């Protein structure tokens, strides 16, 4: 779940 | 008493036959002789002693069921005055009558309540020409305030009212009027109130509290010897009361929450009333929704001991309430809520700033307070660690000390982000205390409060789901687009919809309850996101942002893979999205979903039910998209292959399950919205290719390599072939 959250955070940062 | 009334009526007729102005007096101020005592006592209500009220109460109670309207009205006025003056005796009599052992007694109690309800407006005229300056009646003490604009429509106007005064065109107008009349419910409006052309009301708190016994009698199936059941009478009386004026009916119940900790019973009684009546008229639903929202607002603003618990209890039922409110739109909801600074509590898409700082007090009152800057990623654990370092606690009691809020009774779970709980950036920062507690007591309080908060979140999700489902066929796409953009602009959407309390699941006490709530919340989030997806355009131009919405699905399958309900909900919604967003999932999309399903399939090899469900879902995917799905499956299994990680044998097991037809053990197809015999969504692949031979997979990999041998995808497919 932490990996999923970090992927989501990176995705939001890129946008 | 009926004999007495008949005798008095005969005497009145004799006096009339005896006889100018005397006839006017007889017909305007006598009108009968039986109500002369009661109407006298009503005229002397300010000077009546409490003993007189207690003595007159049983007579006025018995006289409520008179055929004579004047007698009934006078008795109702007298009993309402008694309930105003001696509430305890009136309440005891009402409870004794409503819980009486005789069916006739309970039926008569409900009928007498209805007579009181009718003559509620005819007490002041009967009382005195100069009353209501003396004989003060306490006004209904309303504590909270409704939302500044009313959230829903106050009522649905009846189509073509008979009481409102106003050839192809004539025929079509007649047809339109007939359809409108057939579509409009006349039993759900106050027929006589709206049909009267164009005045306080006396209804004290005991008479209002009598509604709860009537709600319970709505289920009292005991039948009188005349064939009349208590349940029918109670339902009719309460339906008429809620039709006429729900505010007076629900005044007592709504005030009781602010008065005392009674929410777990108020919601129970409201749910009981809704279930027994079976519906909610537009005015009733509007009033109840506005009052419940105002109650949530009140407990958000005024610090109360049971405020959070009351908010959770009302969120557990606002979702049922909102399904009947008419004319409620998401944009107006957001506008009113952010006007009232209470959007976070009932809208799961809130987007509040944060606090940016907060002051934490020490255990000692002479200790110098600390101030911690709050950032987006800060959780209460970091704040607690900084406070322990600041206030000189030498790690001997690190689990003894808890961050706590005193104004609002809150003890903060460490893994909760600060800005989630303190979202407003007002001038005054939140003030916390480094409260020393026995670690077990602190953990118990944290478990309880976390459970209440999770139930609140469940209620928020359910409220949004019901709001979306109430929206008409038109305005569906607008509402869905609003939801999607709100989720995208919400900085903490996937985290809020995907996180869990892993530090609280392990506790043998209050750990499994949190897990049950988590499973419910994940299933609700999947359902809400599917509702959003189905309602968006099928050709919606997506991007990498779809992952933001699909990760939640994957998240729900990481926490609860072995839950059959969660597993079949996941499979149903993924199939629904593959069917709906067909073009997206014919080129991509499976790459956002398949790696998670493959990881779960490989991880839980020992679970034959989970493996069967995943294999059935993959079979349905192959049915929808045949070759593109296999290519996406290989592209999403190539990173996971190993020579933890998806093995090279479980992939072959999945393929062998694909080639042979698999039975639906969890009934996944029954939850598929487009539930038909599933066909290839592309006409080109339309064929009897339900069998997916492994040789076909090998040919696919060979073809992907042959297309571009030096591509990265080429080496992915080479790895898949090697496996």
């Amino acid at each position: 779940v932490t990996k999923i959250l970090r992927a989501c955070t990176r995705q939001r940062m890129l946008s | 008493y009926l004999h007495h009334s008949r005798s008095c009526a005969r005497l009145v007729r004799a006096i009339k036959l005896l006889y100018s102005g005397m006839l006017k007096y007889i017909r305007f101020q006598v009108m009968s002789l039986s109500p002369a005592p009661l109407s006298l006592l009503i005229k002397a209500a300010p000077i009546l002693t409490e003993e007189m009220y207690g003595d007159i109460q049983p007579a006025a109670w018995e006289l409520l069921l008179s055929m004579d309207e004047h007698m009934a009205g006078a008795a109702a006025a007298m009993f309402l005055l008694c309930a105003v003056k001696v509430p305890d005796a009136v309440s005891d009599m009402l409870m004794s009558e409503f819980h009486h052992a005789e069916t006739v007694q309970r039926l008569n109690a409900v009928l007498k309540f209805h007579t009181l309800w009718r003559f509620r407006y005819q007490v002041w005229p009967r009382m005195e020409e100069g009353a209501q300056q003396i004989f003060k009646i306490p006004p209904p003490s309303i504590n909270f305030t409704l939302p500044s604009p009313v959230l829903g429509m106050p009522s649905v106007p009846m189509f073509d009212p008979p009481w409102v005064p106003q050839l192809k065109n004539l025929q079509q107008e007649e047809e339109k009027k007939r359809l409108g009349r057939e579509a409009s419910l006349i039993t759900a409006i106050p027929i006589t109130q709206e049909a009267c052309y164009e005045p306080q009301a006396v209804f004290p708190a005991c008479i209002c509290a009598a509604v709860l016994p009537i709600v319970h009698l709505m289920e009292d199936g005991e039948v009188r010897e005349d064939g009349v059941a208590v349940s029918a009478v109670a339902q009719q009386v309460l339906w008429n009361c809620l039709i006429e004026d729900p505010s007076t009916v629900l005044r007592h119940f709504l005030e009781k929450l602010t008065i005392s900790n009674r929410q777990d019973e108020l919601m129970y009684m409201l749910r009981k009333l809704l279930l027994n009546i079976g519906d909610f008229p537009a005015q009733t639903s509007h009033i109840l929704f506005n009052y419940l929202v105002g109650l949530i607002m009140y407990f958000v603003r005024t610090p109360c001991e049971w405020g959070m618990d009351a908010i959770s209890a009302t969120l557990t039922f606002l979702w049922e309430v909102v399904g009947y409110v008419e004319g409620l739109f998401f944009k107006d909801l957001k506008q009113t809520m952010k006007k009232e600074q209470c959007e976070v509590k009932l809208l799961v898409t809130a987007s509040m700033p944060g606090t940016k700082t907060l002051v934490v007090h020490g255990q000692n009152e002479c200790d110098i307070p600390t101030q911690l800057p709050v950032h987006e990623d800060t959780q209460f654990e970091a704040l607690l660690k900084e406070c322990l370092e600041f206030f000189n606690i030498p790690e001997s009691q690190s689990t003894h000390y808890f961050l706590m809020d005193k104004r609002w009774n809150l003890i903060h779970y460490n893994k909760t982000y600060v800005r989630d709980i303190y979202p407003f950036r007002r001038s005054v920062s939140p003030q916390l205390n480094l409260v020393h507690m026995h670690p077990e007591k602190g953990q118990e309080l944290i478990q309880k409060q976390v459970f209440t908060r999770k139930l609140e979140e469940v209620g928020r999700v359910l409220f949004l789901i019901s709001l979306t489902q109430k929206i008409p066929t038109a305005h569906k796409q607008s509402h869905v687009s609003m939801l999607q953009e709100d989720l995208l602009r919400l900085p903490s959407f996937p985290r809020s919809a995907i996180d869990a309390e892993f530090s609280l699941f392990s506790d043998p006490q209050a750990g499994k309850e949190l897990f049950g709530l988590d499973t419910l919340q994940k299933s609700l989030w999947i359902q809400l996101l599917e509702e959003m997806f189905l309602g968006m355009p099928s050709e919606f131009p997506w991007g990498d942002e779809i992952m933001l919405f699909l990760n939640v699905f994957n998240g729900a399958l990481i926490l609860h893979p072995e839950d059959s309900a969660l597993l079949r909900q996941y499979a149903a919604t993924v199939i629904n999205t593959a069917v709906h967003f067909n073009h997206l999932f014919s080129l991509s999309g499976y790459q956002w979903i398949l790696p998670t399903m493959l990881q779960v399939y490989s991880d839980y090899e020992s679970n034959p039910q989970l493996r069967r469900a995943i294999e059935f879902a993959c079979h349905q995917f192959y049915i929808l998209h045949r070759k593109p799905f296999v290519l996406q499956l290989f592209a999403s299994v190539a990173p996971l292959l190993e020579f933890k990680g998806v093995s090279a044998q479980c992939l072959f097991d999945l393929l062998q399950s694909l080639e042979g037809e698999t039975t639906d053990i969890l009934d996944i197809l029954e939850l598929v919205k487009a539930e038909k015999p599933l066909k290839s969504l592309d006409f080109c692949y339309g064929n009897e290719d339900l069998t997916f031979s492994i040789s076909e997979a090998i040919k696919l990999c060979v073809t992907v390599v042959a297309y571009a041998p030096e591509s990265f995808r080429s080496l992915q497919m080479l790895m898949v072939l090697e496996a």
């Binding site: - | 008949r6 004579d68 008979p162 039948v223 009719q236 709530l517 072995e562 039910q609």
Partner: protein
Amino acid sequence: ACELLERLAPKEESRLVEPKFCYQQLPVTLRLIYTIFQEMAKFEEPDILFNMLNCLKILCLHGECLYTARKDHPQFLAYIQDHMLIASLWRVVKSEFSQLSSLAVPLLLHALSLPHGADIFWTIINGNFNSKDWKMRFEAVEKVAVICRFLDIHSVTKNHLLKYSLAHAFCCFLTAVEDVNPAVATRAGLLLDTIKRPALQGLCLCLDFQFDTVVKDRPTILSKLLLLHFLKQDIPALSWEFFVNRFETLSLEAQLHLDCNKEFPFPTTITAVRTNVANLSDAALWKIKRARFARNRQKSVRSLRDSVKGPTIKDLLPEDAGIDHQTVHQLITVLMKFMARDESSAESDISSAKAFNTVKRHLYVLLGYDQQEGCFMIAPQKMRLSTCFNAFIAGIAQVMDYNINLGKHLLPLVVQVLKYCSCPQLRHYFQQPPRCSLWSLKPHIRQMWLKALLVILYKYPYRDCDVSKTLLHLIHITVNTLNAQYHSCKTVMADKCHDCGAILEEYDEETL
């Protein structure tokens, strides 16, 4: 060990259900079952419990180990049932690991079919759902939901003990839906949706069986069915065929009472089984046996009614003498509530249309109206005093308002009933200008009469060749009701006008 048992087993599941002792000297399989349960009490890993439940499924099912224990070692089966079997199967049921429950539920049903299983399961359900600890109810909701998820509808339809146990558990779950604790109520409401449609259909069949057999459970069963139909309407819980069968059972009871010269609140001609002669029929004879058993053996298997509530031919009811009237009134009100919220279930298929026509004929009969001769079989006073009419007039306005198609179907019957009820006597029904009035009705029944007439006038075409005359008569009755408030000259002790002898009538503003 499970693989070895599979090898030694007949490798074919037999029929799951059929429609102290000495630890040694027992067959080795009974000892193995005993020790598997004993060890399973000591483990919590899902893999361990799954393998152990698989071993039991190979032993208990796939081989008549417990059947042969019942036949040959009754004491051992009694001990196992009372001490380990159902308690441990209930313990191993979890929503997080539904793999365990996939094996637990078939074993649980097999145990229930066996002797001493129903009582233990009854005590478990009653103790859990009636517990004051809200966490225990919270867990029991999950347990029953997961049990329902894996119910084999085919298995339940064979064994009556299974039907009783599942009906009791499902009704307790439905009560937990309407719970005081918000957490338990929300969990129950959310889990009720997670149950698949065939399982819900099987549970509704269990409820129908409970209605048919147990007499004192009928009103609570009807309440639970109405609640479930309200909550999950997609499954058929209330349906036209449901009311057909309920009317069949009630009419069979009525015919039995008529044979025993005792009054019943239901018509004796609705059912198709004539109790005068059986003619060596099969299903009809079984229906007669079930009805007579229900009416005479009221000491049946535990009626769920008390536990459900939250924290030679004739026989008469000793204390609950109004049970029959309650069942009739509740059934008719539930029928009206079904019809009000019916999404045109008829015309979906041939069976539904047949059931709708049957229900329409039965409705004509219930209100005392003979379609063959077009005349009411009863005097207007008997209809007014009738339970069926009182429960029909109280919901007919809502049925006509909410549902238009059924309203169009029911319009002639409704208008005939409305005209007939207001008549003080039979003669008043045959006066061409109706001189009757809404005086013989109860004061709260006049308003429902008027609201039904209002709905008919507001959203129905009443210019038909037949309904128009009766509706004009209804308007005449309304006009006479308005007139009687001011009597102009032109048994219950009442007031008369000494000049003309007519009864003085007064009405309230809500009726005027």
